Amino acid sequence: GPDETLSLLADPYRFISRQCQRLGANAFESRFLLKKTNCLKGAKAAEIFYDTTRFEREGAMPVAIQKTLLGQGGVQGLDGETHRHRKQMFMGLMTPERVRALAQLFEAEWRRAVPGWTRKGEIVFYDELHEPLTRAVCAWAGVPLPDDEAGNRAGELRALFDAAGSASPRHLWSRLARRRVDAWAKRIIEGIRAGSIGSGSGTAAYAIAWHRDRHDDLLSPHVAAVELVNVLRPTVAIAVYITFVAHALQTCSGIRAALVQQPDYAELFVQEVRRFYPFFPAVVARASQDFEWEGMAFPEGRQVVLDLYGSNHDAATWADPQEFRPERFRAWDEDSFNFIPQGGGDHYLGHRCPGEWIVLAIMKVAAHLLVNAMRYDVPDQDLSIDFARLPALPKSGFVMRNVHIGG
């Protein structure tokens, strides 16, 4: 078959579901770079993708991603009992109490940032979110962050994910940002271990610095650093979802009113933001043994990609996936495979995002502040979603004018 790396890169979110629609199937064989790849979409495909007797992650992460978005040696590249033991370290962080504490820190940081936004007169909303998130998550995680370094650290964390999937000199900045953030996080881990940094026993940095692997050994300092970044970085990336929350409030009639008046609505709304908007395009794994599924061959070693966006827009599951309708979540049965913006399956037994509770809690804070606290004007701008960008964003970045929180 032809190599279609370029076709995929031009339409990273929609390429798979578009081909699926043309072929009338939920799976097709393709090729990206050197590797024949089976592309999968939908609930049944997600269920097989998360079967760890048939799929492994070892060696599926590209070098370019190790050097930017994810780092080297982290939980994403692990399988089996080694993976599950490392995953438990992240899950232990996510108690209702700790998630609430992070949400509260983020509201405080958002409120702290508003006067700056007022004084600026006009802001790019997306651009302004990274720093308050950075401040909140570092405080929550037990990571010291001097006031005069917060801006710079926020830019470096942003560069790991916002510049990672950019085929421009921005990728070179992403690589440098990765080297810097690893060295910084490593100094944090070392200081905790030496006792020079007093992170509390409940905090992410403490848990990661003192984690013991399956042989009762501490993580090497570089791996501990990478895992700490695996908490800090994607929390800052919630800027993307917060921007989409603002976008939905601006472009979908009746949403603001429903959020204002109906109490149970916020939960439905943030879930629909995660379903509707493109963010994490797709996940990659490798077949661990020969098998056949739905008449498709999966030879041992075959690269397989699971299309998250397409799955979240599958008409078989949702009926009218093209509409933004929070109400649809009244009928959801909490299935582990049919709604997968942050992965599918089980959080402990597979690679599903442990950050979901944090994401939901922070999106709820954002929705609350944007409807009940913030006042802002939205000038004429290009609000259309850039499906060519990784991560996707409204083309304008969501521009606000005359922002205040006292009214």
Ligand X SMILES: CC(C)Cc1ccc([C@@H](C)C(=O)O)cc1
Bind-site residues for heme b? 50, 57, 83, 87, 280, 342, 351, 353
The minimum distance between CB 71 and ligand HEM, in angstroms, equals: 11
Per rule CB under 6 A, is residue 164 in the interface with ligand X?
Answer: yes
Per rule CB under 6 A, is residue 161 in the interface with ligand X?
Answer: yes
Residues 382 and 398: beta-carbon distance below 8 Å: no
Pairing mode of beta strands 303-307, 35-41: parallel
Which is closer to ligand HEM, CB of 62 or CB of 115?
A: 62
The only residue of 275, 352, 370, 393 in contact with ligand HEM, by rule CB under 6 A: 352
- N-term to C-term CA, the chain: 60
Return d(Cα 336, Cα 351) in angstroms, integer: 12
**Residue type at position 89:** M
- Could you give the angle at the alpha carbon of 90 between the alpha carbons of 219 and 144, nearest 5°? 75
Partner from ligand X, ligand HEM, none contacting 45, C-beta within 5 to 8 A by type: none
The only residue of 125, 140, 280, 337 in contact with ligand HEM, by rule CB under 6 A: 280
Per rule CB under 6 A, is residue 89 in the interface with ligand HEM?
Answer: no
Q: What share of the chain is helix, strand, coil (3-state, %, to 5)?
A: 50, 10, 35
Query: Which one of the spans 17-25, 31-39, 114-122, 229-237 is the region binding ligand HEM (CB under 6 A)?
Result: 229-237
Please give the annotated binding residues for heme, written as ranges. 353
Per rule CB under 6 A, is residue 280 in the interface with ligand X?
Answer: yes
Per rule CB under 6 A, is residue 165 in the interface with ligand X?
Answer: yes
Matching residue, tokens 């990765």: 178
Return d(Cα 177, Cα 67) in angstroms, integer: 9
DSSP state letter for 122: E
Residues 182 and 229: beta-carbon distance below 8 Å: yes
Write out the two tokens for 153.
């650290």
Per rule CB under 6 A, is residue 235 in the interface with ligand HEM?
Answer: yes
Write out the two tokens for 211.
């984690």
**Residue among 346, 344, 127 nearest 236 (CA):** 127
Per rule CB under 6 A, is residue 87 in the interface with ligand HEM?
Answer: yes
Alpha helix positions (H), 211-326: 221-236, 238-251, 255-261, 265-276, 308-312, 315-318
> By rule CB under 6 A, what string of x and - marks binding of each residue 186-225 to ligand X?
----------------------------------------
> How far, CA to CA in Å, does 262 sit from each of 327, 368, 376?
11, 12, 22
The minimum distance between CB 336 and ligand X, in angstroms, equals: 19
The only residue of 218, 252, 296, 353 in contact with ligand HEM, by rule CB under 6 A: 353
Q: Omega of the bond prior to 169 within 30 degrees of 0, cis?
A: no
Cα Rg, the chain, nearest whole Å: 21
Return d(Cα 260, Cα 160) in angstroms, integer: 35
The only residue of 278, 326, 354, 397 in contact with ligand HEM, by rule CB under 6 A: 354
The only residue of 40, 237, 248, 392 in contact with ligand HEM, by rule CB under 6 A: 237
Per rule CB under 6 A, is residue 241 in the interface with ligand HEM?
Answer: yes
> How far, CA to CA in Å, does 239 sit from each of 129, 157, 233, 398?
5, 12, 11, 11
Partner from ligand X, ligand HEM, none contacting 235, C-beta within 5 to 8 A by type: ligand HEM
Which is closer to ligand X, CB of 161 or CB of 269?
A: 161
Return d(Cα 181, Cα 84) in angstroms, integer: 25
Partner from ligand HEM, ligand X, none contacting 238, C-beta within 5 to 8 A by type: ligand HEM
The minimum distance between CB 212 and ligand X, in angstroms, equals: 25
The minimum distance between CB 238 and ligand X, in angstroms, equals: 8
Per rule CB under 6 A, is residue 132 in the interface with ligand HEM?
Answer: no
Per rule CB under 6 A, is residue 233 in the interface with ligand X?
Answer: yes
Write out the two tokens for 69.
């978005």
The minimum distance between CB 390 and ligand X, in angstroms, equals: 5
**Residue among 212, 345, 197, 327 nearest 271 (CA):** 327
Partner from ligand X, ligand HEM, none contacting 161, C-beta within 5 to 8 A by type: ligand X
Per rule CB under 6 A, is residue 283 in the interface with ligand HEM?
Answer: yes
Per rule CB under 6 A, is residue 343 in the interface with ligand X?
Answer: no
Residues 235-264 that bind ligand X (CB under 6 A): 237
Residues 369-398 that bind ligand X (CB under 6 A): 390-391
**Binding positions for ligand X, rule: CB under 6 A:** 69, 161, 164-165, 233-234, 237, 280, 390-391
